């Protein structure tokens, strides 16, 4: 019933963004600029130079660099939601298991030896303030 | 006319990249493969193979950009194109539609209070077709028609785990006043627990799945109550992709017999499970063994 | 913040025709123009213009085609181009819209189980700007916010009178839980009777008309009871976009006041209505006359 | 509740076609044909050669010969939409009074001569099987 409640409590989840409004808002050109690659005719135009390509969306200093960078995670702070952006790393010829470990620190051997054992434990992870 | 079985399965596209290379059997493939065989030989039985089936999936920002966002839609046209995500459009056949059963199933939602979009054009990517493939194989076409049924889960919020379990009871309601006698299944895919993006990427609850298996077998009214922060927090941020089991779900009645369930970790970033569910009254024998629980964890 | 009146207008192409060709004074158009001016006036004084106006009509086959048919949609883009309809763009300004409510309303009927479609990107047809120069005249830009609602009225079935009845209760509650203090209109564009097709077209039916307009005032939960079929036969065939006027008028309380109605019979091939009301608690003056009625057979 | 009896019902309004899924799926290329007339360079184009223009359509011989013969009462038999035709009398410079007048057998000035004078009656129009 209280939008502003409901949004509130994903603040307290550890390691994730779940995309709301606002970060739909912030990330549009971002998203739609990764939709774009759906089309093999774009995907062969940005990879022969993805500079000039990224600079036909009129993305924010930061987002373009996270883009060129191929940094995930800060693809995401600026609005990016890892739907649209499974079109680039695909682009690229890159797993969904890659993308997801290179967020989170590990190496790829790590994440996948991690994935083998089970996986990562909820515990610990579940909110920032309980600490739990 | 008839909703007779509901199954559930994950749509993780590495598992149709393991067909089209040829690793499929590998080993870590291997097992995967083997868990969904006693689906494969089940369904190709007589009286068991659909006529339709309704499959309940995410659009993972295929059909839809950030430009127009259904809550629920439905594919009334007569054939859907595998989507380009990236590597090319899937070498798989085009999926056949329904379109006198999907535009009466549009139609009688609308009567029934659910603000339907009807979708006349639109590719489907591996929400839909990766479960076509572990279940039918590699035909030269679909054994069945298919109607796509995709729910938002991508922009927030996504419909309540309420909504969803109410809107099943309509789909069986509206597939029962069908003229025709036709067996007609309704699929949930996606799940189970997962986390795709952040530093908690990798995040696995077997606990929180399997009482989800649990609860939908048994209870899924009070199941239909959990709040999307309780998905999210303890089955990961793509975990809430378990809220299209509810839909499929609330399509049978509240008897039903679990004939077999196959829990995998991992699948890629995923918890894979698949099920299949009749009504009591009408089901099957369940298989032996009825319950299958692999990987290195378990 | 606040939802403070609610106002309905027909849209019919004509009126912006005659706009533009200079012939709205001539001895047809004339008194209809006639009739809007005391409500360009009023919304024109100190206080009574909105910041922003909610703006419920139906798309008339512009923004949608036959292949996204969505039954309920909201723009919460920040900009929206007129359409081009055959004639070319129709020559106004853009319409500039208000993100953050508009994302809060779709997150809160979302939440309240409505089957939202968020809209992005869309051009406004008739059914939204020929009411925007009816009431603002020809500004440079218009001198409010405006939050465009298409609504399904095209393929069948729309939804019901009394989902659209609840639907504006909705609005109204996530207007008052958005923490700024804004002025909010609801307007519901469309009607009154008439039919564009076939023999029986240039229906017109004053007698059903100024019932609507009675029970929509005294009692609209009766009136949101009245089936499709009673439009229809009744209204004409294009007389169904009458069921957006009770989505305006959901969203202000039981008790309203009347400030002011016009009705013009004819108008191209429709009878014209237009009205202003308030939540009974918080009304104006009613303007004077109150009540205008026109036309050669009126 | 019932689809069917819902449906039903509309077949008793006499000169009436409400559009409903079977006439939709019936008039799919008839109305996305005049959807593209919303574009200024497909109205020349159609302009410059209609029957050339209609052959991209992939219309049935009856839809194609109304278009042609603008005979709106014939294209809503062939599934056409008024709001989606209104695109066609729109690119020929018509207004909807004159679609509409057209589609009653009225000429131009009668039908605007009852226009004036308030208008098609309801009585005796609303039910075939009833009478009224
Ligand atoms: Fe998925
Ligand atoms: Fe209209």
């Given at each position: 019933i209280d939008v502003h409640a409901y949004l509130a409590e994903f603040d307290d989840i550890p390691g994730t963004r779940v995309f709301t409004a606002q970060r739909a808002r912030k990330g549009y050109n971002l998203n739609q600029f990764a939709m774009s690659l759906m089309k093999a005719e774009n995907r062969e135009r940005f990879k022969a130079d993805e500079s000039a390509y990224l600079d036909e969306?009129?993305?924010?200093?930061?987002?373009?660099?996270?883009?060129?960078?191929?940094?995930?995670?800060?693809?995401?702070?600026?609005?990016?939601?890892?739907?649209?952006?499974?079109?680039?790393?695909?682009?690229?010829?890159?797993?969904?298991?890659?993308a997801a470990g290179s967020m989170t620190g590990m190496t790829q051997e790590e994440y996948a030896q991690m994935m083998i054992d089970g996986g990562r434990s909820p515990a610990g992870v579940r909110s920032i303030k309980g600490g739990y | 006319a008839r909703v007779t079985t509901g199954i559930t399965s994950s749509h993780i596209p590495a598992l149709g990249a393991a067909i089209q290379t040829g690793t499929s059997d590998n080993d870590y493939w291997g097992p995967v493969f083997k868990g969904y065989q006693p689906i494969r030989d089940w369904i190709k039985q007589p009286g068991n193979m659909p006529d339709v089936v309704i499959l309940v999936y995410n659009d993972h920002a295929s059909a839809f950009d950030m430009n127009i966002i259904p809550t629920f839609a439905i594919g009334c046209a007569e054939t859907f194109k595998p989507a380009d995500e990236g590597w090319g459009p899937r070498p798989v056949?085009?999926?056949?539609?329904?379109?006198?059963?999907?535009?009466?199933?549009?139609?009688?939602?609308?009567?029934?209070?659910?603000?339907?979009?009807?979708?006349?054009?639109?590719?489907?990517?591996?929400?839909?077709?990766?479960?076509?493939?572990?279940?039918?194989?590699?035909?030269?076409?679909?054994?069945?028609?298919?109607?796509?049924?995709?729910?938002?889960?991508?922009?927030?919020?996504?419909?309540?785990?309420?909504?969803?379990?109410?809107?099943?009871?309509?789909?069986?309601?509206?597939?029962?006043?069908?003229?025709?006698?036709?067996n007609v299944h309704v699929w949930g895919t996606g799940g189970m627990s997962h986390?795709?993006?952040?530093?908690?990427?990798?995040?696995?609850?077997?606990?929180?799945?399997?009482?989800?298996?649990?609860?939908?077998?048994?209870?899924?009214?009070?199941?239909?109550?959990?709040?999307?922060?309780?998905?999210?927090?303890?089955?990961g941020s793509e975990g809430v992709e378990l809220?299209?089991?509810?839909?499929?779900?609330?399509?049978?009645?509240?008897?039903?017999?679990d004939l077999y369930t196959f829990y995998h970790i991992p699948?890629?970033?995923?918890?894979?499970?698949?099920?299949?569910?009749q009504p009591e009254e009408t089901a099957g024998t369940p298989l032996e063994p009825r319950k299958v629980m692999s990987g290195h964890s378990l």
């Open positions: 969306w009129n993305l924010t200093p930061a987002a373009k660099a996270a883009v060129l960078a191929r940094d995930y995670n800060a693809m995401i702070d600026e609005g990016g939601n890892v739907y649209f952006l499974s079109k680039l790393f695909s682009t690229d010829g890159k797993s969904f298991q890659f | 056949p085009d999926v056949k539609g329904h379109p006198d059963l999907a535009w009466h199933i549009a139609q009688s939602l609308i009567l029934d209070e659910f603000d339907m979009t009807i979708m006349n054009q639109m590719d489907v990517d591996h929400g839909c077709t990766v479960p076509l493939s572990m279940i039918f194989g590699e035909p030269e076409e679909w054994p069945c028609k298919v109607i796509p049924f995709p729910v938002n889960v991508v922009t927030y919020p996504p419909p309540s785990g309420k909504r969803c379990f109410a809107l099943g009871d309509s789909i069986r309601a509206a597939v029962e006043s069908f003229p025709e006698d036709l986390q795709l993006q952040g530093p908690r990427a990798g995040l696995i609850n077997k606990e929180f799945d399997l009482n989800f298996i649990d609860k939908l077998i048994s209870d899924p009214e009070e199941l239909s109550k959990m709040p999307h922060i309780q998905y999210l927090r303890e089955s809220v299209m089991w509810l839909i499929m779900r609330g399509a049978l009645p509240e008897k039903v017999r699948a890629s970033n995923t918890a894979l499970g698949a099920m299949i569910l």
